[PDB]
């Protein structure tokens, strides 16, 4: 299998099979040296290779593909670089007591250490534990990058493997390791160490399961440190191999950005063979002044075919501006994702958890979302189950008014006419109690006014009322754990939230339950510990769909053994079907209307659970459990016998009553959905629920308000045929005719040419509740999915109910592929992790007991009410910022590096520069590459409390108007205009070429014109960022002035230094001359004047929505809204 030895110095030149590096594993370090050969060869000192017209497919291809993705990745090479060294320590090298291994230093990252991991240290590889400081090795595994769950499962090193612990007992083990290879797995590993002792000095085994194999993608909490050899390598850790299935290549901008770079090269190779055809017409003239005073050949061919050592000194320099762009947006997107993380209003104050971005790359793709895919249970409902109602032998007293607001659609009663009726009934529950130790602060229980004089005491209805009431709290799956803060309170954890909804209520119902111990379960009487017990448990499973138990009922009379009875509960599939005709409770005037009282509970939208009872035989009571130890508990539990034995004797089933379970919403969801669906985002609810309690909440959280078509699918068939006979079959014709009827009732637009599309928000409001088994027959084949799309595309908010968790990821791939449209997928749970990875932005709700949709997410908002604060504030800012600075980067290079070409016509294209050797270097590094970072970070077009109030500003993002290629070609032509102003305005000062000095001495070098050209280019495209940004301020307005006088202070320092040849005084010669300052105030104007006119013509006469809002914002329409405002909050006014 696999080979890892111990205490070897791990040589490099060895081949021997004792060697660990002779397996030749890769590192975790998965370029810069290629960038260095560019800048050295670019214009000056060390030109390695300048071959001419043969590198023209060599440099333009590497920077757009091989160097774009190297800079694009902000978590594969940045979270891999800053993690080193992860606590390199000093207990190393010199060590004594011999037979003790002298410690070594191999590399930075290697296999063969005893290097610890402390608190908040990202573990460098997969580790098996050896020793700790606590008792029983009280440590665990954490689930932040690769592992997924919430609980802290204790994991032990073996009790004699934990003999070595000190730095005196550190180098006191040696054994070889069996391991496995690449498998793309998470929870599977094999191994066994026959390790060497400390105390005895002998060799002894240790079994290995998966749970001691903690992973690389971890960060430890709540404990100080642990020890171990770095057992497994880092290069085989599968988190980068499992996550993600997509390379998260970004969006409609950074996948169309690399086409915008090529247009920069294509419209600059044209101006290199216009130079090429104009330098060949110079050699064949021979009446010019290049022969007398110049000593060369009487021919062409400087390097090859003319002066090409200049031409490929510009192409190799203009291949540094796309390299500067990719570094420019990976400081903007790292900062636009670091102000989501530092925002106090995207903070889950109940859980102390900010909106943590799990992808620093994408924030721009938030600002152009128009499909939100969600999940009802978890992501827009509260996802804690609580117990509201119950029916008991006919009577179902009191109604906790939560969701009769859509069964009574036409008006709501929460104002005074139904809430305060039952709020006074809720005060009638809480103002007095019949039993003490009822918690009465977190109860919200099945409220109980009085049955017989407030205490309930021949009334056989009460005799079997409290029979099942204690039984749902007696026998259940979870065990009542204790609160460490106070012993009087009892917390309850569960993986099934409905089952702990019963037990937490039945304590607060009455007869206050405290202790569920294997010692026993008490019932208070006499002051003595009267105490019950259970035998066993029967597990609720989705293959079983029901739950029973095995409970102990004692023999309470002397000289006789009485008769017991067993419990049954679950979903109503087979419950109503088995009739009762032999017991005391038959199908009568009670049993059918209580089924109707459980049919009514779904009509007001509750999780209808039932409770039932069992029949047996007296002498078979021991025979019923004597075959269970050999056939059910021994080996055949997961096999199909537990369903067979739960059908054999119970051929008929005895039903008594039912328990109603209700789910609240999360906070601010009916305001958030109201907020997002008016911003232009067609949101689809992909639920795991049936129709009439997913459309019930569909009017509760106001995504459905007016239109929904009444649909009767009424089918029970399947489709085993594909070839012909379509009107012969029932189900495939009827749902497809339903598509074309509700086309032809709403418009004859059955259509085959898919290439028409608007991203506009639909005009007629519509809604679809498709039924799970219909979309499986609608997403199946060709030409039925496209009949499904343009039906759903013509709607406000469709709903898809009873959707399989593979069908969730298929319907989001359908819109993302067959339309050109990116989607969003919000989630919490392992049933739509495939939906998160499918959509281009996957938001994930965190903090619960299930968090596999959190570390696999793209963002980590606390509640759903932050989604309209992430998308509508931090998302549309990240697209009005960044679809503006991207054409502000291909403008400010050709305001400067095109005057190298315009001094070709006044140089006969012979190849002299016009700038320093440091005005080519420090231009796109210090002079003007600083403020286009800050238009990318500090440009709030409207305020944070204004984009929430007016959410329809987000419709700029959907329609793709802030970014298209035609906006880009009017900012390269804006550089090609202002590179004849920034050059010919210091040319026509010198065109008759007198002195230009007050002191008469004159200054006409090539480099004293490129101080007239650079300094009126850096100012005339730093104001151009200042004029075009919204919200001038104190931080970006400061560093747009300290980039306007770095050009005046890098001349005044480098030119005054003697190390700059031709220069001793280009400060005083140039800046103290009145001819610089008289043309500095003209070409700053003539560069701004054709755009401050157009920005004033467009913002007066054909304005956009983002100035119409911010000029109302200074009249004072938005004065009364406070700072620090969000409408989607209950604890604050909405005004």
């Amino acid at each position: 299998l696999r080979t890892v030895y111990y205490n070897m110095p791990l040589p490099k030149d060895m081949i021997d099979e004792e060697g660990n590096p002779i397996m030749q594993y890769p590192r975790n370090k998965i370029n810069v040296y290629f960038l260095v050969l560019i800048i050295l060869g670019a214009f000056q000192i060390f030109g390695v290779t300048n071959p001419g017209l043969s590198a023209v497919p060599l440099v333009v291809i590497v920077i757009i593909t091989a160097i774009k993705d190297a800079i694009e990745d902000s978590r594969r090479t940045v979270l891999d670089l800053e993690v080193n060294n992860t606590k390199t320590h000093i207990l190393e090298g010199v060590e004594n007591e011999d037979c003790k291994f002298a410690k070594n230093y191999w590399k930075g990252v290697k296999v063969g250490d005893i290097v610890r991991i402390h608190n908040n240290d990202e573990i460098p590889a997969d580790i098996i534990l050896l020793s700790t400081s606590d008792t029983d090795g009280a440590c665990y595994v954490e689930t932040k990058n690769l592992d997924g769950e919430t609980n802290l499962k204790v994991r032990q090193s073996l009790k004699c493997t934990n003999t070595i612990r000190t730095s005196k007992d550190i180098a006191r083990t040696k054994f070889w390791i069996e391991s496995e290879g690449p498998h793309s797995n998470l929870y599977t590993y094999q191994g066994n160490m026959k390790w060497r002792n400390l105390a005895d000095g002998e060799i002894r085994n240790e079994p290995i399961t998966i749970n001691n194999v903690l992973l690389r993608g971890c960060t430890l909490r709540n404990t100080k440190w642990a020890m171990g050899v770095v057992m497994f390598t880092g290069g085989d850790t599968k988190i980068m191999l499992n996550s993600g299935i997509t390379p998260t290549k970004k969006s409609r901008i950074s996948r169309e950005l690399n086409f915008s770079v090529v247009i920069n090269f294509v419209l600059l190779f044209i101006l290199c063979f216009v130079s090429g055809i104009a330098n060949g017409v110079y050699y064949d003239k021979k009446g010019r002044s290049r022969f007398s005073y110049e000593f060369g050949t009487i021919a062409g061919s400087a390097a090859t075919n003319g002066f090409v050592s200049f031409w490929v000194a510009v192409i190799l320099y203009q291949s540094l501006v796309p390299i500067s762009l990719y570094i420019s947006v990976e400081i903007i997107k790292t900062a636009q994702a670091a102000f989501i993380y530092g925002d106090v209003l995207l903070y889950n104050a109940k859980l102390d958890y900010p909106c943590t971005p799990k992808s620093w790359n994408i924030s721009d793709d938030l600002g152009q979302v128009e499909y939100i895919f969600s999940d009802k249970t978890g992501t827009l409902t509260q996802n804690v189950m609580e117990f509201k109602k119950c029916t008991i032998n006919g009577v179902s007293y009191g109604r906790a008014y939560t969701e009769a607001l859509a069964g009574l659609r036409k008006r709501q009663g929460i104002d005074v006419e139904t809430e305060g009726r039952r709020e006074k009934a809720e005060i009638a529950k809480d103002r007095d109690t019949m039993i003490d130790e009822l918690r009465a602060l977190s109860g919200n229980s099945q409220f109980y006014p009085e049955e017989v004089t407030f205490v309930s005491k021949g009334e056989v209805q009460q005799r079997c009322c409290e029979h099942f009431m204690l039984a749902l709290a007696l026998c259940h799956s979870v065990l009542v754990e204790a609160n460490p803060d106070n012993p009087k309170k009892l917390d309850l954890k569960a993986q099934s939230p409905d089952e702990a909804a019963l037990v937490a209520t039945a304590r607060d119902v009455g007869f206050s339950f405290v202790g569920k111990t294997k010692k026993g379960l008490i019932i208070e009487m006499q002051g003595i510990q009267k105490e019950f017990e259970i035998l066993n448990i029967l597990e609720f499973n989705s293959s079983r769909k029901r739950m029973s138990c095995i409970v102990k009922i004692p023999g309470l009379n002397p000289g006789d053994e009485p008769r017991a009875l067993l419990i049954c509960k679950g979903a109503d599939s087979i419950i109503y079907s088995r009739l009762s005709r032999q017991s005391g409770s038959n199908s009568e005037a009670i049993l059918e209307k209580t089924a109707l009282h459980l049919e009514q509970y779904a009509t007001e939208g509750l999780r209808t659970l039932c409770i039932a009872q069992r029949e047996l035989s007296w002498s078979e009571y021991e025979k019923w459990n004597e075959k269970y130890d050999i056939a059910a508990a021994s080996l055949a539990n997961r096999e199909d016998e537990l369903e067979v034995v739960a059908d054999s004797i119970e051929r008929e089933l005895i039903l008594l009553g039912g328990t109603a379970i209700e789910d609240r919403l999360q906070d601010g969801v009916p305001d958030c959905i109201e907020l997002l669906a008016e911003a232009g985002i067609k949101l689809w609810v992909l639920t795991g629920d049936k129709v009439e309690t997913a459309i019930n909440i569909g009017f509760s959280c106001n995504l459905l308000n007016n239109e929904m078509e009444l649909l009767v699918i009424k089918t029970t068939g399947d489709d085993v045929k594909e070839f012909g006979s379509e009107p012969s079959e029932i189900v495939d014709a009827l749902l497809s005719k339903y598509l074309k009827e509700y086309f032809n009732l709403t418009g004859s637009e059955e259509e085959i040419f898919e290439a028409k599309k608007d991203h506009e928000f639909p005009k007629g409001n519509y809604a679809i509740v498709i039924d799970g088994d219909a979309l499986k027959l609608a997403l199946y084949g060709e030409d039925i999915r496209r009949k499904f799309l343009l039906l759903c595309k013509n709607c406000r908010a469709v709903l898809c109910c009873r959707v399989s968790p593979s069908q969730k990821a298929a319907v989001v791939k359908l819109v993302k592929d067959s339309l050109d449209v990116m989607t969003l997928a919000i989630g919490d749970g392992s049933n739509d992790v495939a939906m998160i990875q499918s959509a281009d932005v996957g938001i994930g709700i965190a903090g619960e007991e299930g968090r596999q949709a959190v570390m696999c997410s793209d963002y980590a908002i606390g509640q759903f009410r932050y989604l309209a604060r992430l998308v509508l504030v931090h998302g549309r800012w990240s697209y009005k910022r960044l679809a503006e600075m991207i054409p502000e980067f291909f403008y400010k290079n050709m305001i400067f590096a095109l005057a190298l070409f315009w001094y070709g016509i006044y140089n006969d294209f012979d190849g002299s520069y016009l700038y320093e050797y440091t005005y080519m270097m420090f231009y796109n590094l210090a002079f003007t590459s600083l403020p286009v970072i800050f238009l990318g970070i500090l440009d709030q077009d409207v305020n944070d409390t204004i984009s929430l109030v007016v959410p329809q500003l987000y419709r700029v993002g959907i329609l793709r108007k802030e970014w298209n290629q035609r906006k880009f070609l009017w900012y390269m032509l804006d550089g090609l205009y202002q590179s004849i102003i920034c050059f010919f305005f210091p040319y026509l000062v010198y065109h008759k070429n007198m002195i230009v000095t007050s002191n008469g001495l004159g200054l006409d070098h090539r480099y004293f014109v490129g101080v007239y050209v650079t300094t009126i280019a850096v100012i005339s495209c730093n104001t151009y960022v200042l004029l075009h940004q919204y919200r001038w301020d104190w931080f970006s307005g400061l560093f747009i002035a300290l980039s306007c006088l770095v050009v005046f202070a890098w001349t005044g320092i480098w030119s005054s230094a003697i190390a700059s040849r031709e220069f001793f005084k280009a400060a005083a010669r140039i800046y103290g001359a009145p001819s610089f300052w008289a043309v500095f105030f003209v070409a700053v104007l003539f560069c701004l004047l054709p755009r401050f006119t157009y920005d004033s013509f467009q913002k007066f006469f054909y304005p956009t929505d983002v100035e119409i809002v911010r000029e109302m914002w200074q009249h004072g329409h938005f004065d009364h809204y406070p700072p620090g405002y969000d409408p989607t909050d209950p604890n604050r006014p909405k005004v």
């Binding site: 102000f339 106090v344 102390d352 419709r955 070429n993």
Partner: protein, 362 residues
């Protein structure tokens, strides 16, 4: 706990002035630009119309001249004053001889007699123009050596192959000595001698002195210093051979501390035509009338159809005279005014009113 540091910067609550382009912040910004750049466009052309120049081209003075005085054919001179608009007293050449002392292609002292009816007032500058001498090629302007300019020593490889500036064609002859000003710039120097005084002719014979001290910047001798080696193994570049016919002795070593007409030629002019200062007079005024100077021709310009010449001037604070930099303010002023009275001709009759947010209230 991890509430994320509310400090009015991470929530981006920076104090911010929020500019809005209405016709309340724009028309007082186009009118204020249109009224400045016309009264600056008038103040500059007031300064830059009083500037007087004298430009005489003498490149053809060997061929098309006589031993007697003959007027210049007037495609070789132009000059304008601010008191005399129309002025047509033409200057005249006199080509003295072919003196037959190692006679070259182009030699013989052309003596130009010009006539100025005004005063180049306090600082009088004697430049020289050079049209069609393209001195900005790739190999030309990168060919000198900064060790020799700053005065220090040089090996053969310190001047032959160096980064950027290198004396790549011109570091050794067949003998293999080190040229002391190596490079195609200093080798091809303008060596027409100029008089140190403009003679007064016809009226007074009180001469007008013109020194070449302080002919470029005072803070420039800290890189043009004296040489460090005095060797006989250095020799002039192959075009200075008429001036030093036998090499450098112990006496004729050129101190480029103060040989200041060479410090102007070591900045190669960046365009077609080239004007470098060669005679200044910071002491006296230039009285009006008529003068004559004596240029000794040594620079063979005629083969590439180029030009030489004279540029005698008095400089302003804006340098010499150029009608551009004053007329482009009144182009920069009478366009932002014309784009102030178009964006109000449309605003009063298009007429948008500040209203509800359109396209979402449609």
């Amino acid at each position: 706990n991890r509430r994320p540091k509310e400090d009015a910067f991470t929530q981006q609550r920076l104090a911010a002035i929020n500019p809005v382009l209405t016709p309340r912040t724009v028309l007082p910004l186009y009118l204020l630009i249109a009224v400045v750049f016309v009264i600056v466009g008038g103040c500059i052309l007031a300064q830059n119309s009083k500037v007087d120049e004298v430009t005489i081209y003498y490149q053809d003075c060997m061929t098309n001249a006589t031993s007697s005085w003959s007027d210049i054919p007037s495609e070789h001179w132009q000059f304008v004053f601010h008191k005399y608009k129309t002025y047509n007293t033409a200057p005249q050449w006199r080509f003295v001889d072919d003196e037959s002392d190692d006679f070259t292609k182009q030699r013989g002292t052309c003596q130009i007699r010009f006539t100025t009816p005004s005063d180049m007032k306090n600082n009088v500058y004697l430049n020289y123009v050079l049209e069609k001498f393209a001195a900005n090629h790739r190999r030309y302007v990168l060919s000198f050596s900064e060790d020799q300019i700053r005065g220090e020593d040089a090996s053969y490889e310190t001047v032959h192959d160096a980064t950027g500036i290198n004396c790549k064609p011109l570091s050794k002859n067949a003998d293999g000595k080190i040229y002391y000003p190596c490079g195609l710039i200093a080798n091809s120097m303008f060596n027409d001698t100029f008089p140190l005084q403009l003679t007064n002719v016809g009226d007074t014979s009180n001469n007008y002195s013109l020194t070449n001290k302080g002919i470029n910047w005072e803070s420039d001798k800290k890189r043009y210093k004296k040489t460090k080696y005095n060797y006989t193994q250095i020799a002039p570049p192959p075009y200075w051979e008429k001036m030093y016919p036998d090499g450098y002795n112990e006496t004729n070593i050129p101190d480029i501390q103060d040989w200041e007409e060479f410090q102007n030629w070591m900045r190669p002019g960046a365009f077609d035509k080239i004007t470098k200062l060669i005679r200044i007079n910071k002491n006296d005024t230039l009285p009006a009338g008529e003068y004559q100077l004596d240029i000794g021709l040594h620079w063979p310009v005629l083969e590439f159809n180029g030009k030489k010449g004279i540029y005698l001037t008095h400089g302003s604070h804006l340098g010499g005279r150029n009608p551009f930099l004053g007329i482009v303010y009144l182009i920069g002023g009478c366009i932002c005014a014309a784009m102030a009275l178009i964006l109000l001709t449309f605003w009063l009759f298009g007429g948008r009113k500040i209203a509800d947010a359109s396209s979402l209230s449609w």
